Amino acid sequence: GWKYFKGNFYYFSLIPKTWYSAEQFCVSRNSHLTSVTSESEQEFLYKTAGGLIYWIGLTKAGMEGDWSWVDDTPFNKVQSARFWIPGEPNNAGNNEHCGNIKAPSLQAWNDAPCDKTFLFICKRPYVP
Template sequence: MARDDIYENMLMSEVAPPPKGNTSKTLTPWQYRTRGIVTAVLVLLMLALATSLLAVTLLYFRGQRKLQAVEEAVQKLRVSLQPNKTSAKSAKESDALQLLDEAQAGVRMLRDQLGNASAAYREIQTRLDRVTAVRATGPDPCGDVLTKLSKGWKFYSGNLYYFSQGSKSWEEAEQFCVSEDSHLTSISSQAEQDFLFTETKEANHWIGLTDQGTEGTWRWVDGTEFREEANSGDWESSQPDNWHQGVGGREDCVEIRRSKWNDANCTLPTRWICKQARGSTGL
């Protein structure tokens, strides 16, 4: 599709940083302070999770003991109230057995609640393990996140995003993202799409979707699975159309504009969005 906006007076200051091996290891006072804050937060989070884990454990075992005692009592009553083969069952005995059935239903409900407590225990344990793992690696992963935030990256739903001010071709933009331990962004949900649209303020930005290599076979450059049917509503009307603009090929790269996707020529200078996904951020 023909471009309907022209970027003027773009800032072209975004360049790939030098190799990480050449960066200085000297920490600034700000980095020391932020690392101390991150360490304290992690320790407090570990203590809170450990306390929750202990509380759930105590509740679980206390409930387990009560459940066992109730089940034993119900079983004894049921046996004692069973009528003899030679005698007819009285109305009183029938009422008692009905009450026992209701009691057993309550026991089953209690058992389900204990199952939920067990699931909560496992969830808290998983979170505690994650926090412990981050703490064990030292403050560096969190320090990297704070450094990116100080450079203008945005944090959303566990991921870090960079919205450029200058313009590059799709390939150059991806190279920049890779130099920052990221990729041109993938989009996995409508909520993420809405977030990106809000941040781009309707200006066109490259995203990490391309069909370079095999025409019509779209893929996310960061390896995220592309779901054609689920994403069919994300394209602009009549897109993708692989329109030939006469500027060095057809349209094999995708940009986001006005909350929808448009395929465009990969060589056109356009702003871009990098995404450092959950896990890579150390969170």
């Protein structure tokens, strides 16, 4: 059921999980919760999500609580500013340390509690 886009395969889950149980599921399938590194990848993802919320690989790291990607893609704060929903990350209830795709827009991301269950998206490299 994996979808192909620019050198990577993507799995849009049918069952919801917490952010970490989701990441574990991806890791069991030789993948990670997806990073997003271009406007065209953001577009591919939110369009495919069809208006439902999906965990992606956004999570906090370091003392300062900077956002990071679980697949170890360096997080580019400047290049990613345009990808959040206006007002996000707002850190609601001071407990929103993971990120999902929420709005069908280039401005798509929301921070939500890691322990909430959502559908999720895995990303796996194609290696010829």
